[PDB]
Design an enzyme around this catalytic site. Structure first.
Site, PDB file in Angstrom:
ATOM      1  N   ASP A   1       0.840  -1.184   0.000  1.00 38.98           N
ATOM      2  CA  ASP A   1       0.000   0.000   0.000  1.00 38.98           C
ATOM      3  C   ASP A   1       0.883   1.245   0.000  1.00 38.98           C
ATOM      4  OD1 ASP A   1      -2.311   1.798   2.088  1.00 38.98           O
ATOM      5  OD2 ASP A   1      -2.655   1.132   0.035  1.00 38.98           O
TER       6      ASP A   1
ATOM      7  N   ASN B   1       1.342  -5.230   5.422  1.00 41.27           N
ATOM      8  CA  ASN B   1       0.297  -5.351   6.433  1.00 41.27           C
ATOM      9  C   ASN B   1      -1.024  -5.395   5.678  1.00 41.27           C
ATOM     10  OD1 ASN B   1       2.210  -5.172   8.467  1.00 41.27           O
ATOM     11  ND2 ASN B   1       1.492  -3.212   9.286  1.00 41.27           N
TER      12      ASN B   1
ATOM     13  N   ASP C   1       6.283   3.335   2.639  1.00 38.05           N
ATOM     14  CA  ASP C   1       5.790   4.716   2.658  1.00 38.05           C
ATOM     15  C   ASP C   1       5.617   5.301   4.077  1.00 38.05           C
ATOM     16  OD1 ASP C   1       3.334   2.871   2.691  1.00 38.05           O
ATOM     17  OD2 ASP C   1       2.287   4.811   2.648  1.00 38.05           O
TER      18      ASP C   1
ATOM     19  N   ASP D   1      -0.273 -17.896 -39.029  1.00 37.50           N
ATOM     20  CA  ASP D   1       0.322 -18.754 -40.059  1.00 37.50           C
ATOM     21  C   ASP D   1      -0.658 -19.874 -40.471  1.00 37.50           C
ATOM     22  OD1 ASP D   1       2.444 -21.264 -40.569  1.00 37.50           O
ATOM     23  OD2 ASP D   1       2.922 -19.380 -41.637  1.00 37.50           O
TER      24      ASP D   1
ATOM     25  N   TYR E   1       9.130 -22.658 -51.958  1.00 42.25           N
ATOM     26  CA  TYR E   1       9.480 -23.490 -50.801  1.00 42.25           C
ATOM     27  C   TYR E   1       8.404 -24.545 -50.449  1.00 42.25           C
ATOM     28  CZ  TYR E   1       6.136 -21.246 -47.780  1.00 42.25           C
ATOM     29  OH  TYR E   1       4.963 -20.842 -47.216  1.00 42.25           O
TER      30      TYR E   1
ATOM     31  N   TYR F   1       1.129 -28.933 -45.211  1.00 43.83           N
ATOM     32  CA  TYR F   1       1.324 -28.454 -46.590  1.00 43.83           C
ATOM     33  C   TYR F   1       0.975 -29.483 -47.680  1.00 43.83           C
ATOM     34  CZ  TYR F   1       4.381 -24.557 -44.829  1.00 43.83           C
ATOM     35  OH  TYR F   1       4.883 -23.434 -44.210  1.00 43.83           O
TER      36      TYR F   1
ATOM     37  N   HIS G   1       7.404 -12.348 -40.088  1.00 40.31           N
ATOM     38  CA  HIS G   1       6.447 -13.438 -40.077  1.00 40.31           C
ATOM     39  C   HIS G   1       6.079 -13.857 -38.660  1.00 40.31           C
ATOM     40  CE1 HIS G   1       5.483 -17.858 -40.195  1.00 40.31           C
ATOM     41  NE2 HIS G   1       4.578 -17.381 -41.032  1.00 40.31           N
TER      42      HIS G   1
HETATM   43  O1  LIG Z   1       3.794 -20.165 -45.496  1.00 37.84           O
HETATM   44  C1  LIG Z   1       3.495 -20.552 -44.397  1.00 37.84           C
HETATM   45  N1  LIG Z   1       4.386 -20.636 -43.392  1.00 37.84           N
HETATM   46  C2  LIG Z   1       5.747 -20.564 -43.460  1.00 37.84           C
HETATM   47  C3  LIG Z   1       6.497 -20.098 -44.542  1.00 37.84           C
HETATM   48  C4  LIG Z   1       7.880 -20.138 -44.505  1.00 37.84           C
HETATM   49  C5  LIG Z   1       8.540 -20.653 -43.398  1.00 37.84           C
HETATM   50  O2  LIG Z   1       9.902 -20.718 -43.397  1.00 37.84           O
HETATM   51  C6  LIG Z   1      10.460 -21.897 -43.997  1.00 37.84           C
HETATM   52  F1  LIG Z   1      10.006 -22.049 -45.232  1.00 37.84           F
HETATM   53  F2  LIG Z   1      10.103 -22.950 -43.288  1.00 37.84           F
HETATM   54  F3  LIG Z   1      11.778 -21.827 -44.044  1.00 37.84           F
HETATM   55  C7  LIG Z   1       7.817 -21.145 -42.325  1.00 37.84           C
HETATM   56  C8  LIG Z   1       6.434 -21.095 -42.366  1.00 37.84           C
HETATM   57  N2  LIG Z   1       2.253 -20.976 -44.127  1.00 37.84           N
HETATM   58  C9  LIG Z   1       1.094 -21.089 -45.015  1.00 37.84           C
HETATM   59  C10 LIG Z   1       1.256 -20.763 -46.498  1.00 37.84           C
HETATM   60  C11 LIG Z   1      -0.038 -21.055 -47.250  1.00 37.84           C
HETATM   61  C12 LIG Z   1      -1.176 -20.213 -46.676  1.00 37.84           C
HETATM   62  O3  LIG Z   1      -2.420 -20.543 -47.273  1.00 37.84           O
HETATM   63  C13 LIG Z   1      -2.635 -20.426 -48.614  1.00 37.84           C
HETATM   64  C14 LIG Z   1      -2.486 -19.201 -49.266  1.00 37.84           C
HETATM   65  C15 LIG Z   1      -2.720 -19.124 -50.642  1.00 37.84           C
HETATM   66  C16 LIG Z   1      -3.104 -20.271 -51.360  1.00 37.84           C
HETATM   67  C17 LIG Z   1      -3.360 -20.204 -52.843  1.00 37.84           C
HETATM   68  O4  LIG Z   1      -3.677 -19.044 -53.414  1.00 37.84           O
HETATM   69  O5  LIG Z   1      -3.283 -21.203 -53.547  1.00 37.84           O
HETATM   70  C18 LIG Z   1      -3.253 -21.492 -50.693  1.00 37.84           C
HETATM   71  C19 LIG Z   1      -3.015 -21.567 -49.322  1.00 37.84           C
HETATM   72  C20 LIG Z   1      -1.310 -20.471 -45.178  1.00 37.84           C
HETATM   73  C21 LIG Z   1      -0.002 -20.194 -44.452  1.00 37.84           C
HETATM   74 CL   LIG Z   2       9.949 -16.599 -43.107  1.00 39.91          CL
HETATM   75 MG   LIG Z   3       2.559   1.110   2.884  1.00 39.24          MG
END
Ligand SMILES: O=C(Nc1ccc(OC(F)(F)F)cc1)N[C@H]1CC[C@H](Oc2ccc(C(=O)O)cc2)CC1
Ligand SMILES: [Cl-]
Ligand SMILES: [Mg+2]
Ligand SMILES: O=C(Nc1ccc(OC(F)(F)F)cc1)N[C@H]1CC[C@H](Oc2ccc(C(=O)O)cc2)CC1
Ligand SMILES: [Cl-]
Ligand SMILES: [Cl-]
Ligand SMILES: [Cl-]
Ligand SMILES: [Cl-]
Ligand SMILES: [Cl-]
Ligand SMILES: [Mg+2]
Lengths: 547, 547
Positions: free
Chosen positions: B10, B123, B184, B334, B382, B465, B523
């Site tokens: 307090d 207290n 205080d 993500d 990727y 993916y 990201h």
């Molecule tokens: O890309 C990521 N994550 C990510 C990207 C890169 C990364 O770094 C590393 F690649 F692993 F090195 C780690 C995570 N997540 C997905 C991508 C697809 C998205 O969803 C979509 C977006 C667009 C389409 C389409 O227009 O066809 C489809 C799915 C959801 C998030």
């Molecule tokens: Cl990234």
């Molecule tokens: Mg006090």
């Protein structure tokens, strides 16, 4: 003969039926008979309502398409609608007005309990209104009692199309002659019959039940009140909180709302609350059913002083601390009962309300030692037998199945004295090797307790009786206090150890104490009179633990 | 030199001080100067207030003993009090009016962060009023940042008695010259000095901080905004729900209120929300931070089809089902982001509100295949490298430490291309064996992720993916729908993969969509700009997810 049973939702598992609002509203506002129902059905399979039920559109999406149908339905029948005719307002009230048809649900339960695979088959929608939670709630309470819930707006098919009955059968993994199907609309039954199924048109429930009773050969109508919903341990959320380097507390969590913390007795587990956990969740609460320190998946360290009330209570506060909870309602039975009173007395900032089954709040007598106070009650003799570490453990652990079958018994079927237990040389000395199964428990339910006490044994649990002098010195700190927080005391007529008489002076310390009492009820209150316990606790909770 | 620091509650950790209400009320109601303070102090150690602070009586017990002192204090000074002078009403408002002194708390945090053992010495009383929860709340937020919280009404000693300073030292396991003590009230410091301790009289906070800064030799005043509270994994409630015979979902739970479900991305864990979990709990919510299927303590079955959106989403519904929840607020980042949009779109009855960081709601294009849609974005290259089972796993698993240190990087410190990853023959091919530690993460924080992916590896995570065609056919069911539930989209300026541009068309499908944007943010939004994320989410939650 048949081993499956499928129930319609609207007008069968839930009443009153929403289709009846179409009829009701018309009559109420003096609209031409059928006018709304035409607007609802406008287009058949190609119309807006069918699209909704197939899950192509949401409810909020359908609302205006319906209102738009109502303006042109009313044009062709040369009339118009009142100034504030609101289809959202009609369907809002209709849907919440809908409640569970309890006799139909109990009938589905009985069938499944006697080996039937059960499912819901409903034409329903993707509900995205602000007040959609009311429906989602009803569905969560309903779906949990069935093997499958086939919703039209999820499978992309709809009654009365033959393809959804093919889906139903694929899901039930059952040929059409092995299945009954109940519905309130005749059109929905003709597809079922052509495939061979048994069908029942539901109008009034009792006649629908009578028919089902016939074709199944199982008593469904007029049967006794069933027990509440139990819990399947594999189906629960299991939680785990470290409260201290060597102590982890395990608990089972179900529901949302104010936190309610259930503290079992000796020698029990979280499962001792199986009949309360679903009830209170449904009543509108977040049940946290403990494994108290010493039992089951909670840590059970060897040291006696680890089970004194002060340590135990601090740990429960840490349990709250780490779960991010400023308070909880605390409800105890047996030793939990005592603990819970001492939580309200030492940490009232953290207790929303306190409630005990059987166990009365007993203050420490500051003149007389507890050893002598316990010695003064001949039915507490068994507690003295427990004082010597290892002796009581040896007996209780020898045959875990025997132990639980001979403890868990109703007032009118006992095997166990409590007086003269030291003299006689043990708890079970005049009770059999294979005691009969009590009416309170299935064989399976007993073996759950067996598994839990295979983990840490009985030394932990027994240590709760072995700090009588330490709890006394602690308790004597609180002799100037009172409990002025909401507090319920529930006595059990035929608990011959925690007798209701022991509770008579509690008003001195707890002035606004409320009470509950249960006739014909032994020590094991939760499984003996589950319905009465559930009911007493819910009333109190709703009046004494809210904003 | 000293390695401990003890703070008064307090008037030091909490302001404005309740003693100041004694003075304030007097002036306000035109009472004789001191009149209330006399009544408060009546009897000294033998008086009612001291008893209260020692824990012999509760607050509700003390209230009338105080009012009774006020009637006889006013008798001797020949005056009387107004008709509705209510001491409960004075202390009710005073106590809730009390808030945390943020600069003093941040100063205690910094000291502890630089190796000091910290404690509260207050207290205080056993608070049993109806509105006691307000205090218990403040104490839960305050106590979690200190090694010890010594409350007078629990130890049975009180400032300024020398015995509680002996207790303090025993608890700190530290000699009096190794400890600073701020308060205080000057009387509370003379016992500390006689034992040898360093003492600071707190009046204004800034000068009190200036002194503490001096005698510690640590920058406390004027230092930068610290990060939010992280989470210690050993200190959390860990939950576990079986959703299906082979799949168990693990989550971390903190707080009370509406359920908020946090769904992490690739390749992450519940810990990715460490900076959000305590904030939102404190904001008034029940945070359920997931380990999504595939990661950490959640099950990670081998099959690719187990990580398609439809299966994943059904499982999350079962997760709710079994926890007794009709709804939750769903917040994703993500891949979690995408999932969460698809939950709002297929199960809106179960979503209170939807919210995504970085990931935009993208509908399926019903003409063009996803394989080609992904192929059309050079920065998605990727994802094609990820399609072949086992290849991507081998690289990511080879050196778990390297992998996480090279992924978890802020916009302005990168090592990793995303274009030409197939061509180049892997993610890390032009990035080092021992990448530098990013500013977003400690070494320890990295090794947490290392341990989690030692369990089930990267095949589960990567399978998310590998259902691009399956998610597409599913998604195409929803092309006639819209999201009309509360929905927040949070873009990150310098996320070079999920670029804010991708979100521009979302209003077509989501008409009352609200937005948040974060400048200079890669990201990994949660750990990059935690304060901005916490702030954006809390505002939305308070306006868009309440009764
Ligand atoms: O890309 C990521 N994550 C990510 C990207 C890169 C990364 O770094 C590393 F690649 F692993 F090195 C780690 C995570 N997540 C997905 C991508 C697809 C998205 O969803 C979509 C977006 C667009 C389409 C389409 O227009 O066809 C489809 C799915 C959801 C998030
Ligand atoms: Cl990234
Ligand atoms: Mg006090
Ligand atoms: O008796 C039980 N439980 C119990 C009793 C019998 C039992 O069966 C069997 F003994 F194990 F066989 C199983 C459990 N629990 C305690 C008894 C003491 C009570 O607390 C008191 C009551 C009175 C005093 C006193 O006046 O000295 C002290 C503690 C809390 C509940
Ligand atoms: Cl189900
Ligand atoms: Cl039974
Ligand atoms: Cl008994
Ligand atoms: Cl603490
Ligand atoms: Cl950091
Ligand atoms: Mg029907």
């Amino acid at each position: 003969t048949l081993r499956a049973a499928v129930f319609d939702l609207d007008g069968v598992l839930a009443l009153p039926a929403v289709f009846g609002v179409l009829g009701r509203t018309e009559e109420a506002l003096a609209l031409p008979r059928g006018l709304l129902n035409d607007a609802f059905q406008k287009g058949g399979p190609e119309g807006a309502t069918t699209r909704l039920m197939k899950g192509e559109i949401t409810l909020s999406q359908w609302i205006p398409l319906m209102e738009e149908n109502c303006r042109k339905c009313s044009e062709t029948a040369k009339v118009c609608l009142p100034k504030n005719f609101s289809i959202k307002e009609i369907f809002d009230k209709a849907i919440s007005a809908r409640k569970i048809n309890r006799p139909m649900l109990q009938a589905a339960l009985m069938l499944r309990k006697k080996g039937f695979t059960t499912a819901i088959l409903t034409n329903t929608w993707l509900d995205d209104r602000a007040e959609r939670d009311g429906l989602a709630q009803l569905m969560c309470e309903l779906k949990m009692h069935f093997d499958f819930l086939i919703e039209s707006c999820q499978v992309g098919m709809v009654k009365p199309e033959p393809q959804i009955y093919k889906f139903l059968l694929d899901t039930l993994k059952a040929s059409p002659s092995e299945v009954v199907f109940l519905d309130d609309i005749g059109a929905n039954l003709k597809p079922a019959r052509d495939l061979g199924m048994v069908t029942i048109l539901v109008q009034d429930t009792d006649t629908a039940l009578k028919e089902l009773e016939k074709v199944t050969g199982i008593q469904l109508l007029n049967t006794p009140a069933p027990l509440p919903t139990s819990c399947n341990p594999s189906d629960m959320s299991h939680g785990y909180v470290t409260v201290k380097p060597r102590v982890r507390l395990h608990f089972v969590e179900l529901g949302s709302g104010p936190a309610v913390c259930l503290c079992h007795g000796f020698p029990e587990s979280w499962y001792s609350w199986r009949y309360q956990i679903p009830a209170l969740a449904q009543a509108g609460y977040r049940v946290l059913a403990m494994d108290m320190k010493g039992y089951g998946e909670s840590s059970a360290p060897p040291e006696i002083e680890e089970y004194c009330m002060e340590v135990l209570c601090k740990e429960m506060v840490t349990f709250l601390d780490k779960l991010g909870l400023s308070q909880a309602v605390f409800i105890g039975h047996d030793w939990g009962g005592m603990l819970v009173w001492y939580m309200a007395l030492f940490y009232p900032e953290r207790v929303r309300a306190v409630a005990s089954l059987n166990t009365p709040f007993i203050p420490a007598n500051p003149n007389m030692s507890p050893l002598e106070s316990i010695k003064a009650n001949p039915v507490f003799d068994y507690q003295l037998y427990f004082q010597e570490p290892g002796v009581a453990e040896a007996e209780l652990e020898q045959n875990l199945s025997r132990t639980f079958k001979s403890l868990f018994r109703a007032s009118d079927e006992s095997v166990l004295s409590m007086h003269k237990v030291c003299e006689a040389g043990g708890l079970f000395v005049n009770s059999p090797e294979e005691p009969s199964l009590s009416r309170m428990v299935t064989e399976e339910e007993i073996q759950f307790y067996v598994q839990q006490f295979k983990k840490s044994g009985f030394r932990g649990p027994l240590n709760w009786y072995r700090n009588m002098e330490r709890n006394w010195k602690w308790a004597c700190k609180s002799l100037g206090r009172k409990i002025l927080i909401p507090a319920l005391m529930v006595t059990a007529e035929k608990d011959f150890v925690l007798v209701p008489q022991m509770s008579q002076h509690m008003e001195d310390w707890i002035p606004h104490l409320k009470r509950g009492h249960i006739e014909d009820c032994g020590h094991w209150t939760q499984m003996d009179k589950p319905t009465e316990v559930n009911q007493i606790l819910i009333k109190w909770l709703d009046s004494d633990a809210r904003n």
